[PDB]
Amino acid sequence: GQTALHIAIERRNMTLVTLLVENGADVQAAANGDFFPGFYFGELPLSLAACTNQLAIVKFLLQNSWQPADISARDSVGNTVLHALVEVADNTVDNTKFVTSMYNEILILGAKLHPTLKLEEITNRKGLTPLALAASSGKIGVLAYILQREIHEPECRHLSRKFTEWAYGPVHSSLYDLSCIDTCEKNSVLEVIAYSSSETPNRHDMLLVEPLNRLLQDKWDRFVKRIFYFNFFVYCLYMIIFTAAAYYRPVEGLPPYKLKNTVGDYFRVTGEILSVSGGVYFFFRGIQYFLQRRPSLKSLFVDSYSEILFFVQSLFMLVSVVLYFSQRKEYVASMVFSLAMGWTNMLYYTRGFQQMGIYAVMIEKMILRDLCRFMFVYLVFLFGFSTAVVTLIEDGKYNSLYSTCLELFKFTIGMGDLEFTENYDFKAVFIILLLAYVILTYILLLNMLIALMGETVNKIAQELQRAITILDTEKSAFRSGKLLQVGFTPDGKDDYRWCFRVDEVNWTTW
Amino acid sequence: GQTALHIAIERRNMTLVTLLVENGADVQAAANGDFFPGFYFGELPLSLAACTNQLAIVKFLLQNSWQPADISARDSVGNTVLHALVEVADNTVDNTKFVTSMYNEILILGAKLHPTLKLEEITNRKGLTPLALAASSGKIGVLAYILQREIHEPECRHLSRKFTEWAYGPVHSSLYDLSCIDTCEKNSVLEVIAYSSSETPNRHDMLLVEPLNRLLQDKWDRFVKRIFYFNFFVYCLYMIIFTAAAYYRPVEGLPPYKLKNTVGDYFRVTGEILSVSGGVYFFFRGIQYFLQRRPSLKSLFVDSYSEILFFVQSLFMLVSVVLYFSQRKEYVASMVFSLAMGWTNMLYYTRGFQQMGIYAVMIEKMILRDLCRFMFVYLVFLFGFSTAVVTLIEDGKYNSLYSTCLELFKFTIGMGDLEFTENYDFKAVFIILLLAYVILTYILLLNMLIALMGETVNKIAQELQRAITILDTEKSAFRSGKLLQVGFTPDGKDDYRWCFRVDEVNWTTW
Amino acid sequence: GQTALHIAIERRNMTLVTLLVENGADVQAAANGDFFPGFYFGELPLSLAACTNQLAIVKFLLQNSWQPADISARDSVGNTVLHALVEVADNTVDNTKFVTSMYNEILILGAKLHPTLKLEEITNRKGLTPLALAASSGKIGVLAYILQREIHEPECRHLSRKFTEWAYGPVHSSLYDLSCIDTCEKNSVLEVIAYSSSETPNRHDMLLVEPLNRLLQDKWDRFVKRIFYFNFFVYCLYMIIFTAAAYYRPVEGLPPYKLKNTVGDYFRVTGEILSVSGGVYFFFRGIQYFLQRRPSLKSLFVDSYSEILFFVQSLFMLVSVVLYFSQRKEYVASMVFSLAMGWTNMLYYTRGFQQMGIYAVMIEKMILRDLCRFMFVYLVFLFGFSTAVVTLIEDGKYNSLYSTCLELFKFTIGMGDLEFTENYDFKAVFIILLLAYVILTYILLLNMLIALMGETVNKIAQELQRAITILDTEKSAFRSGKLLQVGFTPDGKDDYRWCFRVDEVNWTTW
Amino acid sequence: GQTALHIAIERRNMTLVTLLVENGADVQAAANGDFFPGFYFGELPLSLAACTNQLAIVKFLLQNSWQPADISARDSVGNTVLHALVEVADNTVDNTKFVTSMYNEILILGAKLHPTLKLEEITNRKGLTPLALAASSGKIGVLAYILQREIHEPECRHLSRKFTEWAYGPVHSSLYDLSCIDTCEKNSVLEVIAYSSSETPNRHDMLLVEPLNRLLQDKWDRFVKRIFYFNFFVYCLYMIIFTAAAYYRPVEGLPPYKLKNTVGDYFRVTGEILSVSGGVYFFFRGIQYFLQRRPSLKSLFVDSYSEILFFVQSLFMLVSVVLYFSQRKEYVASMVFSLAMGWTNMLYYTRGFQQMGIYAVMIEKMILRDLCRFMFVYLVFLFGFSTAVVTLIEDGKYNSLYSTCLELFKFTIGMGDLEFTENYDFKAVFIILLLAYVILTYILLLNMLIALMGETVNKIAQELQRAITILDTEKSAFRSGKLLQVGFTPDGKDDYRWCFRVDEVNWTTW
Ligand code: NA
């Protein structure tokens, strides 16, 4: 699908390009090769020039007597030259510098040639703006350049995003464009950075850009602290009510239980109803959370490992209700399961409280990454050695697998047991096997712990929990801007862009 | 409240300032704006010039035909130009360099114009000298510059603080001004650095400046070692006497106890009186310590966590006396409480003894920061799981909460208990709950310990206990200087400033 | 054995060398001194010049009217000038640079003078090419230079190994010579790097050179994943069959056991036959592995510590069979030993699964390096203290060594025992000895663990498991190349060298 | 005591010094001031000039028409100019460079003016050569310069210490002067570095200088390996004999024991005699070791902590003999004590065996530095809490201190005990006290371990055991040189200086 102009752009023989354009060959068309091993640039000469160190060629292409190159052209994916430039970024110092410079130059040139049109709002077929993709794909450099972009040339000042409302000696106040940042209402940058599954390279590094962290802190201190505390208090109240109702369970038999006229019975019924309603609410919240987020199965356990616990607790409560209305005695078992699991899940609110711990990330390094491994290996060892031992046994209580495993389990943990290291032949063989099993398992545990410590030392000497907490609570006085005035457009109309006031104290470069 | 001269100082159009002053507009007045978002400089043109890179403007302002600018002017807060310069410091290399240079230049110029006056002793309304505020607010750079300041120009040599009594080849001896350092008797710098609540940025970094550490070591080796050892010995004697008196408590009944003529009874009465007197003394010492220090409630536990223990021990002893003189049998309980707590508090003297341990700071990282967290979480888990278990129980001894919690406590710690994992339905449910509880609690403990180790490795690869011990013991042969002679004043009078002899061995720059 | 030309080469008096050669003295001969304290260079003037900063002298020697120096001469060891240059490399930046430059220059010059001959294929008496020795002896720099060598001069382009099939803007594809790399079929470089005993300096650092890692990954993802999973599955199946057969062992007496017509008996016989066949297969695989590798006795335990376990398991199974066919009752003991050991050896497949753990190298730092040390020291302590204690004992059950050691063992581990700290004189002496023993042993354990952690922190902050797994499984759709065309030889014949396509995305130096 | 010439040397007015010397004032005399706050230079103008950046003045002083300055003058301490220069060194890069240059210049000048005299052998009143003091006082730079000193000027080449017997291309062999290094027979440098108490700054850093480490390794591989192994074997034999003799102790009563004619009795008597002789030998070796070393009391435990153990073991054996020949039954107790302690002391030979452990220095960081601290604190806690508890007790078995402490000891370690948490009032008080005691003690232990790990990580990331082992075994085929020839003296006599051949492979600077 390649055409001569594409090769000339690649060869950069600007004489040949000028000769091809002098006849007026073409300036758009498109490449559609399977290769286009491969390399993607937007299947256009405009994008090809913009992406491969061509300022002269792109300047010549965008406007010319024979056939001006439309800058608003949308490709099969809708990849505009700006969106293609975003797609090509690779997060390198030289590459980042060059791509930011190219973005600036192309934007200013397009504005100067066509001031009425605004290329920033252009979106692809998927329905994403170039900044939205820069955030989704993890392009830190392009995002950093855009979020604090500024233009110092008349007739295109409107394209800038950061300004300086007033400067005073050392202190000077700067304004930031929050449009498409806090509430884009469609694919807000914060939302995309937060939602996006955990494989993007620099999800954490992209929430430290200047406006974002301050915006999150402002939202927090505005309302989210109160929302979080209210949720914590109401959850504690619900758990206390559930515990009180479950403690006073009647022992007559085979529910349902008939209401007896008394204050205690009325209170018990009220508490039962409230607990069931709360469990039902949790079930619905979890199911619709899953519906609207649609996370990857791989991310269910690595991420969002608390919502699953809440959902299964709700499942336990619902199963308890079902068994309660079926004349069964296992409703109590299900109820106690749910109660204990809720008391455990109360830990979710440990966050939002600095005092409770700053480095609570080892929970994820350990409750799965090492606990599950150790349990698996230990169970395999248990089964194998128990089978060997029971095979060695002649008769008695321990010629069965379960009895032998239950006691080989006891020896290991120091509970010990009644010494059945006796009453059979091959005494030395049995003692040797027992020693081997106990040693090996404790060796394995010792390794898990050594690995934990060795990882934590540099995980803590090499390097956002609230960045997610704030958004989730927000999505359980929510503007974060005031519609300032930053001049006018190419036309003479007041421009309003939800500026976020920020003031920094500086004491040099006066 | 801003006036044209203020703007001109900000704009730095020294032509415009010269024109404004040529008419003789004004050179003092004051700014009083709510803003004066904000920025503080001393609400004067003199301070404004001194604080914002103006040497020419300040030189022109301080003296001029039309209206010389009084350098001794005191503002609403009493902020002199020097005190304002101290207030503006932000602890940056360039900012520190500039502010120190400005301080030097302004001091020398003011001395030259008005040699009789001494601006250093000037104090604000609060009653603090500029050095005192530099120490209180945590301005390390300004303090470091001032403490070892020196002037190499005749007619202003008196303003210097560091000198060179005699230089000998490699070795040369320098003298340091200790006025307002060791015993200012009002707001001594050491005292301010020590008292100041724990939020100042660099309280530790400000006790390493050259004179201070040597001064503290000299005071220590002079007297404080002996004072500390004497206190330790007398406390041990008192504790031994108290233990001996408490051991021989009579068992007759319902004090007070009538004196029986015998040597043992006389000794017992003497010991009881001495112990009560000591407890009373501790109570008074603690109460008046609290009165004269008035620490923040937030700093009671983080800092001064031993004085609180001593005070509560004294409270226990006093309550014991009160119950003793009321015909009650709980005086023994209170007495044993106080005795045990004093034996524990004996640890306070572990400091002052290098040999006992250099890195004993983990006490603070752990006895509160992790012990309290773990206890809280473990108690919550205990309550929830015990309620669940007792709800599951049908009848018997363990259908009560306390009996179940007392045994669920025993399983966890390896004491175990008589196996009540029996004699009821839902056996598997109970065993599952028990396993969950035990596991979870030990998982939590394992995390606390991992966090401890991971924090300690770099707390000990990244970075004063005696700096506080020495001052406190001093405040339970206390001069640290000898009134040397360092020349004369602008007048012809001998100058005495409590020089502290210091000699350093150097082998370069000859 | 040294001759004047050798000294002149050492002295570098190129005038004297030219005068010696003008008469036509000689250009080959050989040195044979015991010294040739010592220094090896290939016992030739050609090699001596090439190895000691002589380009002019080597250029003059290789060709001259009087006596051209044959470059293909082979010495007593067969050390060609190229092979000698490889032997002299010492892995230093300057030395590496110089030796690579000398190799390049000598190769190109030899090709230009004698294009028909190919010096690369030349091999020593041992039967190794220069690259093979560079890999065997651990010469990283020479290997790195050779593996990605390239020549930019006509008439010798064939000597190059790396090419550029097509370059496209940023992306450009390069081809690598895999001849003598993947399957040399004689002494392949990968094979030599892997086999070579563990004393070579940089066995790990030599498997990161550009082509090698990508080649290993390609082989893995091609077939080795499937081979490994198939082996794991079949081993699990065999172990399950063995366990099932061993569980149902009859209890009649004194094998062999007569076949009773029933489905269960048929299945039991089938399982027994399969298990014996598997053990026999493992025995043969291990013995022939040892035969064909012939590792050092020192490397048996440090390396290949799993094959030994498999072999001894097979030995246990064979001994079980032998005792089974001899009317003995210890076949069961041998069978259970083999069963347990196989269940343990199942851990070998933990590798090949990232998820199970990345840092599983501490196994080697600990299962031997610390476990064996601790066991040895603890057993010595046990023997000494038990002898002392039994000597102290007067009469009773514990006047024998075994009874005392069995109980001194119990005290230490917290099992405790029936308190025999009673019923004899010198009570305090016994208690003191017991305390000493217990303390000392736990002190020793505490040290082993401290050393483990202190080593692991920097072993994990300072710095291939699959590099060996892949080769071993390969040697349990195996080409890794496609016979590309890279031009022609000095003659006009198509050249085929098993190119490995590789494409790298680069965004600079255009 | 200062004289005008001293001041002029200090002022460096070489015109004034020339004028003072023109009259011929004096060139020796001496300073004797109490100051000579202070600064020591050798109380001479020659030493003063040499020590304070004076080459011109020292050159003028050493020789002049009026009064040549004797360079061999010895002061009150005998401080020659060279010895004074050694004394003044402070181990700084600039100071080290300058002092080495001054030493070189003064030595060469003194040799040229007076070639017959040799200033190196000059010794102070204490009887030490300048190199000996450089080693004793910890002057690393001066020692490093001297040990590999070289002079490239005829008529003074003899003063050099390092030479080059033969250079061959890359490899070149250098010879080192071992006189006064290996066996000075008086105050050998190695001996001084080893003996010297543990306060010298860089005892370790001074055993890495080029000749010393190679010399130690050569001595080791020559004989010390065999000596060490022989000692280990003979000690093991003696311990086995002692254990066998002690096992068969007769039980008749009240030694001495009459000899009964039998092989067993003869063997028993032989073993007893051998054991007593060995203990006696150890006692004598230890006492005379202490006599000839005379270490500081502070260094007895920090250093040489194994010789003390051996000596006390010998004391136990001797006391056993004494009680044996006095008709007492405690000879057995003493014998078992000595036997157990010897079995423990066997650990001393763990060194000399790399395999047993490289980082076995934590023994010293822990067996004293933390074990003793923890034991002390724990015993204090034990006493205090036990006194409190026994005071609380009313009657029964535990109204005595020992019974209560013995059980409060048991609770802590998990042995537990028969639950006496019962049968008295103030139940809650007792339980609270018990919890407090147990917690506090385990908290303290946890801290000791945390400190251990935190210290070991950087003690092992920041930085000789055999350096001491080798010397001690040597001092339980001992030349290490061969009397090479290195030219002649200023006279025409062959010079012999025990050269140590050393050859280094170098591949640059040809
Ligand atoms: Na136990």
Residue numbers in the entry:
A (entry chain B), B (entry chain A), C (entry chain C), D (entry chain D): 201 to 236, 243 to 603, 627 to 692, 699 to 711, 719 to 752
Give excerpts from the publication:
The capsaicin- and heat-activated receptor, TRPV1, has served as a model for deciphering lipid modulation, which is relevant to understanding how pro-algesic agents enhance channel activity in the setting of inflammatory pain. Identification of a pocket within the TRPV1 transmembrane core has provided initial clues as to how phosphoinositide lipids bind to and regulate the channel. Here we show that this regulatory pocket in rat TRPV1 can accommodate diverse lipid species, including the inflammatory lipid lysophosphatidic acid, whose actions are determined by their specific modes of binding. We captured several states of TRPV1 ranging from channels in which the VBP is empty to those bearing different bioactive lipids, including distinct phosphoinositide species, brominated phosphoinositide analogs and a pro-algesic lipid, lysophosphatidic acid (LPA). Together, our data show how the VBP accommodates a range of bioactive lipids and how occupancy of the site corresponds to the structural status of the pore.
We therefore obtained cryo-EM data for samples in which diC8-PIP2 was provided to the empty-pocket TRPV1 preparation. Using focused classification, we were able to identify two key states, one corresponding to a closed state (3.0 Å) and the other having a dilated selectivity filter (3.6 Å). In the dilated state, diC8-PIP2 sits higher up in the vanilloid pocket such that the inositol headgroup sits above Y511, which is reorientated toward the pocket. Moreover, Y671 adopts an α-helical conformation and M682 and is oriented toward the pore axis. These features are hallmarks of a channel in which the resident PI lipid has been displaced (that is, the pocket is empty or occupied by a vanilloid agonist). However, there are some differences between the diC8-PIP2 dilated state and a typical vanilloid agonist-bound structure. Most notably, in the diC8-PIP2 dilated state the angle of the S6 helix is more dramatically tilted such that the voltage sensor-like domain (S1–S4, VSLD) is pivoted outward away from the central axis, and the upper region of the ion permeation pathway, including the selectivity filter, is expanded and stabilized by cholesterol and another membrane lipid (probably 1,2-dioleoyl-sn-glycero-3-phosphocholine (DOPC)). At the same time, pivoting of the S6 helix makes the new restriction site formed by M682 narrower. Thus, this dilated structure is consistent with the functional effects of diC8-PIP2, which enhances capsaicin sensitivity, but by itself activates the channel only at highly depolarized states (for example, +150 mV membrane potential)8,9. In this case, one ligand can bind to the same pocket but with its inositol headgroup located in two distinct positions associated with closed or dilated pore states.
